[PDB]
Design an enzyme around this catalytic site. Structure first.
Site, PDB file in Angstrom:
ATOM      1  N   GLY A  66       0.682  -1.212  -0.073  1.00 40.13           N
ATOM      2  CA  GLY A  66       0.225  -0.131   0.007  1.00 40.13           C
ATOM      3  C   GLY A  66       0.603   1.079   0.147  1.00 40.13           C
ATOM      4  O   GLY A  66       0.261   2.422   0.022  1.00 40.13           O
ATOM      5  N   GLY A  79       2.466   2.644  -2.567  1.00 41.60           N
ATOM      6  CA  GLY A  79       2.324   3.182  -3.615  1.00 41.60           C
ATOM      7  C   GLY A  79       3.095   2.804  -4.745  1.00 41.60           C
ATOM      8  O   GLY A  79       3.632   3.524  -5.648  1.00 41.60           O
ATOM      9  N   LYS A  80       3.538   1.472  -4.776  1.00 35.10           N
ATOM     10  CA  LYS A  80       4.370   0.713  -5.843  1.00 35.10           C
ATOM     11  C   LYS A  80       3.675   0.800  -7.334  1.00 35.10           C
ATOM     12  O   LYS A  80       4.356   1.316  -8.304  1.00 35.10           O
ATOM     13  CB  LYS A  80       4.841  -0.630  -5.477  1.00 35.10           C
ATOM     14  CG  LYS A  80       5.517  -0.670  -4.106  1.00 35.10           C
ATOM     15  CD  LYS A  80       5.940  -2.132  -3.843  1.00 35.10           C
ATOM     16  CE  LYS A  80       4.735  -2.915  -3.660  1.00 35.10           C
ATOM     17  NZ  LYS A  80       4.109  -2.629  -2.199  1.00 35.10           N
ATOM     18  N   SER A  81       2.471   0.330  -7.314  1.00 36.37           N
ATOM     19  CA  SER A  81       1.627   0.082  -8.606  1.00 36.37           C
ATOM     20  C   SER A  81       1.347   1.530  -9.120  1.00 36.37           C
ATOM     21  O   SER A  81       1.420   1.675 -10.412  1.00 36.37           O
ATOM     22  CB  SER A  81       0.298  -0.706  -8.337  1.00 36.37           C
ATOM     23  OG  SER A  81       0.809  -1.991  -8.108  1.00 36.37           O
ATOM     24  N   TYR A  82       1.140   2.623  -8.373  1.00 32.16           N
ATOM     25  CA  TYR A  82       0.661   3.759  -8.702  1.00 32.16           C
ATOM     26  C   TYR A  82       1.966   4.555  -9.520  1.00 32.16           C
ATOM     27  O   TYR A  82       1.661   4.921 -10.469  1.00 32.16           O
ATOM     28  CB  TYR A  82       0.343   4.769  -7.666  1.00 32.16           C
ATOM     29  CG  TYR A  82      -0.090   6.204  -7.926  1.00 32.16           C
ATOM     30  CD1 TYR A  82      -1.408   6.158  -8.525  1.00 32.16           C
ATOM     31  CD2 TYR A  82       1.027   7.104  -7.960  1.00 32.16           C
ATOM     32  CE1 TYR A  82      -1.779   7.619  -8.973  1.00 32.16           C
ATOM     33  CE2 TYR A  82       0.562   8.584  -8.464  1.00 32.16           C
ATOM     34  CZ  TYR A  82      -0.773   8.457  -9.010  1.00 32.16           C
ATOM     35  OH  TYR A  82      -1.233   9.953  -9.310  1.00 32.16           O
ATOM     36  N   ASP A 141       7.288  -4.425 -10.648  1.00 26.81           N
ATOM     37  CA  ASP A 141       6.478  -3.870  -9.734  1.00 26.81           C
ATOM     38  C   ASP A 141       6.301  -4.982  -8.712  1.00 26.81           C
ATOM     39  O   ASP A 141       5.514  -6.134  -8.886  1.00 26.81           O
ATOM     40  CB  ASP A 141       5.077  -3.596 -10.344  1.00 26.81           C
ATOM     41  CG  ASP A 141       4.160  -3.072  -9.139  1.00 26.81           C
ATOM     42  OD1 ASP A 141       4.399  -2.658  -8.058  1.00 26.81           O
ATOM     43  OD2 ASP A 141       2.832  -3.069  -9.585  1.00 26.81           O
ATOM     44  N   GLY A 177       4.506  -6.658  -1.792  1.00 31.65           N
ATOM     45  CA  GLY A 177       4.759  -5.792  -0.608  1.00 31.65           C
ATOM     46  C   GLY A 177       5.927  -6.447   0.362  1.00 31.65           C
ATOM     47  O   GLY A 177       5.747  -7.529   0.798  1.00 31.65           O
TER      48      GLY A 177
HETATM   49  N1  LIG Z   1       2.007   9.781  -5.618  1.00 33.08           N
HETATM   50  C1  LIG Z   1       0.645   9.516  -5.193  1.00 33.08           C
HETATM   51  N2  LIG Z   1      -0.179  10.442  -5.581  1.00 33.08           N
HETATM   52  C2  LIG Z   1      -1.521  10.405  -5.252  1.00 33.08           C
HETATM   53  N3  LIG Z   1      -1.899   9.019  -4.867  1.00 33.08           N
HETATM   54  C3  LIG Z   1      -1.148   8.103  -4.725  1.00 33.08           C
HETATM   55  C4  LIG Z   1       0.255   8.286  -4.942  1.00 33.08           C
HETATM   56  N4  LIG Z   1       0.979   7.167  -4.579  1.00 33.08           N
HETATM   57  C5  LIG Z   1      -0.192   6.239  -4.419  1.00 33.08           C
HETATM   58  N5  LIG Z   1      -1.336   6.839  -4.474  1.00 33.08           N
HETATM   59  C6  LIG Z   1      -2.623   6.249  -4.037  1.00 33.08           C
HETATM   60  O1  LIG Z   1      -2.350   5.280  -2.889  1.00 33.08           O
HETATM   61  C7  LIG Z   1      -3.125   4.101  -2.768  1.00 33.08           C
HETATM   62  C8  LIG Z   1      -2.076   2.837  -2.632  1.00 33.08           C
HETATM   63  O2  LIG Z   1      -1.219   3.040  -3.614  1.00 33.08           O
HETATM   64  P1  LIG Z   1      -1.102   1.506  -4.549  1.00 33.08           P
HETATM   65  O3  LIG Z   1      -2.104   0.841  -4.660  1.00 33.08           O
HETATM   66  O4  LIG Z   1      -0.524   1.738  -5.856  1.00 33.08           O
HETATM   67  O5  LIG Z   1       0.067   0.756  -3.680  1.00 33.08           O
HETATM   68  P2  LIG Z   1       0.978  -0.479  -3.843  1.00 33.08           P
HETATM   69  O6  LIG Z   1       1.254  -0.796  -5.237  1.00 33.08           O
HETATM   70  O7  LIG Z   1       2.215  -0.342  -3.029  1.00 33.08           O
HETATM   71  C9  LIG Z   1      -0.162  -1.681  -2.939  1.00 33.08           C
HETATM   72  P3  LIG Z   1       0.379  -3.656  -2.873  1.00 33.08           P
HETATM   73  O8  LIG Z   1       1.738  -3.896  -2.157  1.00 33.08           O
HETATM   74  O9  LIG Z   1      -0.654  -4.227  -2.735  1.00 33.08           O
HETATM   75  O10 LIG Z   1       0.833  -4.060  -4.492  1.00 33.08           O
HETATM   76  C10 LIG Z   1      -3.839   4.140  -4.151  1.00 33.08           C
HETATM   77  O11 LIG Z   1      -5.094   4.461  -3.755  1.00 33.08           O
HETATM   78  C11 LIG Z   1      -3.126   5.173  -5.033  1.00 33.08           C
HETATM   79  O12 LIG Z   1      -3.795   5.566  -6.015  1.00 33.08           O
HETATM   80 MG   LIG Z   2       0.593  -2.599  -6.347  1.00 30.73          MG
END
Ligand SMILES: Nc1ncnc2c1ncn2[C@@H]1O[C@H](COP(=O)(O)OP(=O)(O)CP(=O)(O)O)[C@@H](O)[C@H]1O
Ligand SMILES: [Mg+2]
Length: 333
Positions: free
Chosen positions: A98, A100-103, A246, A249
């Site tokens: 969570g 913000g890796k995928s974002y 990507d 976690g």
């Molecule tokens: N730089 C940023 N600006 C605005 N929103 C952001 C952001 N980075 C992340 N977010 C938001 O934070 C939330 C979690 O981010 P994300 O889903 O990409 O995390 P993640 O990929 O690390 C989860 P996992 O580990 O389960 O794969 C999402 O709702 C995303 O849109």
């Molecule tokens: Mg992700």
């Protein structure tokens, strides 16, 4: 060797943190990121310096907000240019579930919210179509896989349940057996494959049936440049492999790849043996972590007090990666 470049990025609070009235324990200035200990406010805050410390905690209306466009223009653009020079490149997103890796890597498809992968692909085809030297022709091939509990699945062919076997070619290194490799001639086409691929990733009831926090996604592009010249008639070839990762976690077994990645990074930072083979991820990425490749890490950080331990750990692993150096001569014109 060329040092593995490292950037860390902090996002805005998420629903969970807001529901708990989380305060921000992260500060940034220049390339420095500082973290405060919420439990022991009596200590001095720990600071870390990186190639980039992206402050994305607020929103685009802030002059100081680090946008998708800046994140890509700094590191994404740099790696693509290296691909054009003929170098293999890699960018991987690392961090707590969570953070913000995928974002950062994929982003969303609106509102100029697209991440590194979509922007790089678009930039790649734009540069190719801007070519004016007819002696140059190009070929772009893509592959997309998921690594879950050491199991590898072809995301461009969810039509086969084969858990593809990762092998070691006797001479050419590690590869995923029978992983599909598709030719694409436009950004629209590559985006379409990306979209269906993203639709094929493993989900978890535990994550409210959202993409499993434990799967790794590896997006590969094989960029081939062919340069002709009417003369002797030999076309020369330059092949660059672009690996966009990507990760799951950071917090046949569930966390092997991630724990092994940590060990590999630690060992490499120290050395300058390495357990590449102890996991499918580190095995496939062997040359990107110490080998013949230009690599970059983007570490995602939660800004919340409740994630202190996990965020500190990410910052420490990003600090070590910064110490890794990979091992990658023309004539005066
Ligand atoms: N730089 C940023 N600006 C605005 N929103 C952001 C952001 N980075 C992340 N977010 C938001 O934070 C939330 C979690 O981010 P994300 O889903 O990409 O995390 P993640 O990929 O690390 C989860 P996992 O580990 O389960 O794969 C999402 O709702 C995303 O849109
Ligand atoms: Mg992700």
């Amino acid at each position: 060797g060329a040092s593995v470049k490292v950037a860390v990025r902090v996002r805005p609070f998420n629903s969970r943190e807001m529901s708990r009235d989380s305060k921000c324990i992260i500060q940034m200035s220049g390339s420095t990121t500082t973290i405060v200990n919420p439990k022991q406010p009596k200590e001095t805050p720990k600071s870390f310096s990186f190639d980039y410390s992206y402050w994305s905690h607020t929103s685009p209306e802030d002059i100081n907000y680090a946008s998708q466009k800046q994140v890509y223009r700094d590191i994404g653009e740099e790696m693509l240019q290296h691909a054009f020079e003929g170098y293999n490149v890699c960018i991987f997103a690392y961090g707590q579930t969570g953070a913000g890796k995928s974002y950062t890597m994929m982003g969303k498809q609106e509102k100029d919210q697209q991440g590194i992968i979509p922007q790089l692909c678009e930039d790649l085809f734009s540069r190719i179509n801007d070519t004016t030297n007819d002696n140059m022709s190009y070929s772009v091939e893509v592959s997309y896989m998921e690594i879950y509990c050491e199991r590898v699945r072809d995301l461009l062919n969810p039509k086969n349940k084969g858990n593809l076997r990762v092998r070691e070619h006797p001479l050419l290194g590690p590869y995923v057996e029978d992983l599909s490799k598709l030719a694409v001639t436009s950004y629209n086409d590559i985006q379409d494959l990306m979209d269906s691929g993203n639709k094929a990733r493993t989900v978890a009831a535990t994550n409210m049936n959202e993409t499993s926090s434990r799967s790794h996604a590896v997006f590969n592009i094989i960029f081939t440049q062919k340069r002709h010249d009417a003369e002797t008639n030999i076309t020369t070839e330059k092949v660059s492999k672009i690996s966009l990762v990507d990760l799951a976690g950071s917090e046949a077994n569930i966390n092997k790849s991630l724990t092994t990645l940590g060990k590999v990074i630690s060992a490499l930072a120290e050395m300058d043996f390495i357990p590449y083979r102890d996991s499918v991820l580190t095995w496939l990425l062997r040359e990107n972590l110490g080998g013949n490749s230009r690599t970059a890490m983007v570490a995602a950080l939660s800004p919340a007090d409740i994630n202190y331990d996990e965020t500190l750990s990410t910052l420490r692993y990003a600090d070590r990666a910064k110490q890794i150096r990979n091992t990658v001569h023309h004539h005066h014109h």
